[PDB]
Amino acid sequence: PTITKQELYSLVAADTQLNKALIERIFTSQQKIIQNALKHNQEVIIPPGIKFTVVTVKAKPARQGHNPATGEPIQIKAKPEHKAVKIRALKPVHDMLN
Amino acid sequence: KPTITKQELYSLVAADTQLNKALIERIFTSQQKIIQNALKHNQEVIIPPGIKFTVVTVKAKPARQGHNPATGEPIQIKAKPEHKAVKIRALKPVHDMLN
DNA sequence: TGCTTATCAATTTGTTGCA
DNA sequence: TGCTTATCAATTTGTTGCA
After folding, report:
1. Is A5 helix (H, G, I), strand (E, B) or coil?
2. Which residue of A has its CA nearest to B18?
3. Which class would CATH give A1-98?
4. How many angstroms separate the CA atoms of A29 and B48, rounded?
5. Which option is the CATH number for B1-99: 3.30.200.20, 3.50.30.10, 4.10.520.10, 3.40.50.2300?
6. In sequence order, what DSSP letters do the residues of chain B get, joined into one string?
7. Which bases on strand D have an atom closer than 7 Å to a protein beta carbon?
8. Which of A3, A25, A36, B27 stands 20 to 30 A from A81 (CA)?
9. How far is CA B29 from CA B40, B57, B81, B87, in A?
10. Is residue A98 exposed (0-12), middle (13-18) or buried (19+ Cβ within 10 Å)?
């Protein structure tokens, strides 16, 4: 399972009866549109209805974890504050199973 | 700040690639067909810019008596049963867009 | 009448912030 | 975690203004 993006390019290119090079071409630009938008603190909604959003994640300190299998305490490095791209589904995405 | 809708996204894509807006949509519409066919056939699928689609099941939740603080209304929720729902997940190629 | 009405209004149904 | 959360957002459906 788990159809990859390269398989998706081919899957779409075959259905539309078009070269896969154009398929990646159109998608590569869409990618740039998204990145440049989020870099300018915009919100974007893309097919099939996914909304892109810049958001702030508050810093999290360190805390030493433990591994059950290897039995060695494993420290996680404290994660400072940073921005993260948050996506969330919208109307047609859930409707896809109707 | 304004928000880019998928319609004005088609036009941004259509101008940047120097192609008709109709073909830009004919491909995203096709992408919508493929994605849906996969989920209804219980298969994950990753799309650009690196979003993964998984169909998952949610567990039922009962009713609860709410209260709208603007109204003063005590309002009622309808208990929501078990059902299917698709979940997405931001693969890290998407977080790298802020690099 | 009937609208790509209209920083609509009233509505149910997720999603986020913070104590 | 869950709210008598938020002047939230994102849906869905009803009413009005204006040509």
Report:
1. helix
2. A26
3. few secondary structures
4. 11
5. 4.10.520.10
6. --EE-HHHHHHHHHHHTT--HHHHHHHHHHHHHHHHHHHHTT--EEETTTEEEEEEEE--B---EEE-TTT--EEEPPPB--EEEEEEEE-HHHHGGG-
7. 3-7, 10-12
8. A36
9. 17, 26, 31, 20
10. exposed
The two tokens of residue B78 are 């309808």
Please name the method used to determine this structure. X-ray
Phi-psi region of B74 (alpha: psi -120 to 50; beta: other; left: phi over 0): beta
For residue B69, give both structure tokens.
Answer: 């603080």
Cβ partners under 8 Å of residue B8, min gap 6: none
Question: What's the token pair of residue B58?
Answer: 């949610």
Tokens linked to B27: 């491909």
Q: Which nucleotide is closest to the Cα of A58 by its C1'?
A: C17
**How many angstroms is the resolution?**
2.8
